[PDB]
Design a protein around this nucleic acid. Structure first.
Lengths: 242, 110, 124, 93, 123
RNA sequence: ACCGGCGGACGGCUCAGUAACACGUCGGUAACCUACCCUCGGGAGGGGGAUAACCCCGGGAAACUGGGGCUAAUCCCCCAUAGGCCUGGGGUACUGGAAGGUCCCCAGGCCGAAAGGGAGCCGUAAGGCCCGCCCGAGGAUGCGGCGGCGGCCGAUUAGGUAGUUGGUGGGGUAACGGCCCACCAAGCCGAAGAUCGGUACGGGCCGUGAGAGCGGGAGCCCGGAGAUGGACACUGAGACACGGGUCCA
């Protein structure tokens, strides 16, 4: 019987968010633990091999990652198992190429190209707030990163707000709030790859999160959960969103 | 008066137990059901019953089943048999007690 | 072994057959049996996941507390009453909730020597 | 003859990637040396840096697919391109 | 024919000698760490080691191996063979950390069966 | 070849048991753990000690195994402070529907960190670049435990269960709990079939049929269980560990 932690992942069981042929082979890259969840990330190796066609063989891909030619969020990463997850910015300076990771309407991830000037801004959902010794306020984002700030600035932030993060130097730029009428891009669910405006927030007790209702560009109304709602602008999207 | 997060008024009695969700350290998280008290003999204990109809795919009729659940009866409310009560999942408490009464929707006499 | 696991009997009564062997993550450990002595003797124990925990096998001093919240480190003379068992008070065993006699007087233990490794109590 | 369907540029690897088709009506599938020495002409490439990976001979077709590399320096191909294909092209004994 | 190996801390040099006859009876009943003047042991150590040695140079029994090859553990009383579970100590060479193995090792006391004896010089 | 960094708790193989919260679904931890991975705030001092390899000799048929010489680190060890834990008192902010927790002050006690580096460029050098260490708070991977419902046959097996069922107070555990223990009570299950036996890993499915349905779980994937049978430890983040250990048959 099994006796502890896995180190493998068969191709057939891979998450449904990966545009990977499944019956060609049997063994895939098990992502190591990292910023984003299994359900909202892919190894960088597959990004290099499939989504960009730069490497045909994983050994060569790993070699190019060893050269450290790749800038994710303004940081080189050699780990060919890095979970590169949702709303990350991939930058290749050798090619001057910049994409943002975003899901599909179907529920799969694609690299939407973005302008270079946008490549330095990363919006982060405020997952939760906590008090650390010294009465300091630490905010845990959707991607697992953490930011420390003063007690006085605690009310500048609330959970479910979006912080436009300057990833190259880790500088907080703007805080989009969660209030009626914001512009929101969905992350998961049947309403994936939708962008609309908020009319109502459904306060649900008994273990069930807040169901926001989103009004699309064409005026059609639908519903999704709080955590799937990701604000990107007060009235228009501050980033190129398909 | 402390909030349980369930739309129901709090019991008037304030008990000193550590196991009253209104008057103790324990929490609530999981489903909420409703049912009837069938037995109360063991101390601070209750067996809640629940009837429901189940569908037979081959016979297209309905089977009425009776399901029992053990739960803890805090003294503040003091549930008795014949009473319609509300039940919530709770921390494991005994060998079998894994649910707790939160209120008495309607006692026996009514 | 010390196995803190399934009861062999169902709630109704039908005896339960085992289908697998015991698991080291599921076994427990011996009782500390903290006693009154002239010095503090303690054992540190490596635990599940590499944690640690210290265990008083003999206790000499106690941290009594006034209702105000001021603490006094003192000695422990003898245990008055052990509600957990009648054999324990007879054998100077020290357990949470026990009524103890120190130089100050009567105290009630509000800490577990088995897991904490120190004994705290409230003056009565 | 040889007709190029595609030439792309791996800038992270400093290499040209060439997809092409070979017309060989009624005549056996060509040897590697000839296709290399004849493709070397019309893109102005150094023979050593250029490597051809696969020439797929289709069943019941006079067109065979072909796919090849073109590096920019001696060191990069040794560092990256594994020894076997160098042996197939003869670039290593 | 006890094979006694005498080792010098001062020089880091060790030499083998043989013992038979009454001198053997002298070393029976002794224990590891026991001290004995070389005079009762009757070796011209000054000749073997080719150096001057004080007449009060003594020999201390330290170890050896049985006939079959079971050393005497200083921590085990008696001259017999007993099986012991060794996590460490003489006669046990572990490889993997925390590994434990059961072996049969002689107890400290010297016996006639023992064929190898080890002694260290002392001045 | 050595201590030492890692791994050999994954993956490979099989279906005896097991009629079970083993399992399918949904919840479920505020009652867990967590090495390598990510983020953020802080820290990385002083001092001491060890023995392999190698050289001198040794046994036994072996397996295996002795003593003396000296030797290394991020090895071991003591202290420095943080820090970990527990309690009393007093307050205030965060999380959250919820509870209480977390935040701070005071008071009492035990426990209680680190590691530098091979090379190269500049710098006399230090230092910087690169890799590596530790404390604290999160995340993430994997796992622990609680639950409603679903899913066999027998009545020529009808009464069953004593830590049995609950309460008080503790113990041990990573963790809640009869898991255990001392006491206090008389429960709890069964004709909408317990108890007992026969039978049997559960699912995604597959064969057949116009379909209702009937029958089956071998081949892949997911979950569960095992290493001839039993039973018990050490190392460890993870084990009772196919290619590690101990006894019995």
């Amino acid at each position: 019987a099994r006796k502890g932690p896995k180190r493998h992942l068969k191709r057939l069981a891979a998450p449904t968010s990966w545009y990977i042929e499944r019956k060609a082979y049997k063994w895939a890259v098990r992502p190591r633990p990292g910023p984003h969840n299994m359900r909202t990330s892919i190894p960088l190796l597959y990004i290099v091999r499939d989504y960009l066609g730069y490497a045909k063989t994983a050994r060569e891909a790993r070699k190019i990652l060893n050269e450290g030619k790749f800038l994710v969020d303004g940081r080189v990463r050699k780990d060919y198992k890095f979970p590169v997850g949702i709303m990350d910015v991939v930058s290749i300076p050798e090619t001057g190429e910049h994409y943002r990771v975003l899901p599909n309407r179907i529920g799969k991830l694609i690299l939407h190209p973005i302008s270079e000037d946008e490549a330095f801004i990363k919006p982060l959902r405020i997952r939760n707030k906590r008090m650390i010794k010294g009465a300091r306020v630490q905010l845990n984002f959707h991607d697992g990163t953490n930011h420390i700030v003063s007690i006085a600035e605690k009310d500048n932030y609330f959970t479910s707000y979006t912080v436009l993060m300057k990833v190259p130097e880790r500088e907080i730029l703007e805080v989009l709030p969660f209030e009626k009428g914001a512009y929101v891009f969905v992350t998961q669910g049947k309403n994936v790859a939708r962008k609309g405006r908020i009319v109502e927030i459904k306060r649900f007790p008994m273990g069930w999160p807040d169901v926001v209702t989103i009004e699309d560009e064409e005026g059609e109304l639908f519903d999704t959960l709080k955590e799937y709602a990701f604000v990107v602008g007060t009235d228009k999207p501050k980033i190129s969103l398909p | 008066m402390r909030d349980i997060g369930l739309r129901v008024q709090p019991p008037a009695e304030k008990c000193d137990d550590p196991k009253c969700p209104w008057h103790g350290n324990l929490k609530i998280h999981g489903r909420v059901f409703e049912g009837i008290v069938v037995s109360d003999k063991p101390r601070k204990t209750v067996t809640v019953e629940r009837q429901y109809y189940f569908y037979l795919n081959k016979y297209e009729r309905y089977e009425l089943r009776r399901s029992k659940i053990h739960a803890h009866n805090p003294p503040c409310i003091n549930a008795k048999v014949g009473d319609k009560v509300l039940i919530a999942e709770t921390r494991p408490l005994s060998k079998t007690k894994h649910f707790v009464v939160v209120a008495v929707l309607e006692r026996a006499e009514e | 072994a010390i196995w803190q696991g399934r009861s062999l009997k169902k709630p109704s009564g039908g005896r339960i057959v085992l289908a697998r062997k015991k698991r080291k993550r599921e076994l427990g450990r011996e009782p500390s049996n903290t006693r009154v002595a002239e010095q503090d003797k303690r054992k540190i124990i490596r635990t599940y996941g590499g944690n640690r925990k210290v265990r008083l096998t003999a206790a000499a001093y106690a941290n009594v507390f006034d209702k105000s919240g001021k603490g006094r480190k003192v000695r422990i003379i003898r245990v008055i009453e052990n509600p957990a068992n009648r054999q324990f008070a007879r054998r100077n065993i020290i357990t949470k909730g026990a009524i103890i006699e120190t130089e100050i007087g009567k105290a009630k233990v509000t800490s577990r020597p088995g897991q904490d490794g120190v004994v705290n109590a409230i003056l009565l | 003859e040889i007709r190029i369907k595609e030439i792309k540029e791996n800038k992270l690897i400093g290499r040209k990637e060439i997809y092409f088709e070979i017309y060989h009506p009624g005549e056996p599938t060509p040897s590697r040396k000839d296709v290399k020495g004849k493709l070397v002409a019309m893109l102005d490439l150094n023979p050593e840096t250029t490597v051809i990976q696969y020439i797929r001979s289709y069943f019941g077709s006079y067109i065979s697919k072909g796919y090849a590399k073109a590096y920019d320096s001696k060191e990069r191909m040794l560092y990256i391109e594994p020894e076997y294909i160098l042996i197939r092209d003869g670039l290593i004994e | 024919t006890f094979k006694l190996v005498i080792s010098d801390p001062k020089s880091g040099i060790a030499k083998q000698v043989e013992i038979t006859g009454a001198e053997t009876e002298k070393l029976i009943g002794k224990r590891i760490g026991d001290q004995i003047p070389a005079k009762e042991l009757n070796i011209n150590l000054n000749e073997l080691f080719g150096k001057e040695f004080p007449e009060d140079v003594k020999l201390e029994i330290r170890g050896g191996t049985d006939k079959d090859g079971f050393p005497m553990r200083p921590d085990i009383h008696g001259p017999r063979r007993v099986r012991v579970l060794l996590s460490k100590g003489p006669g046990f060479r572990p490889k993997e950390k925390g590994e434990r193995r059961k072996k049969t090792v002689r107890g400290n006391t010297i016996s006639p069966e023992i064929v190898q004896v080890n002694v260290k010089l002392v001045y």
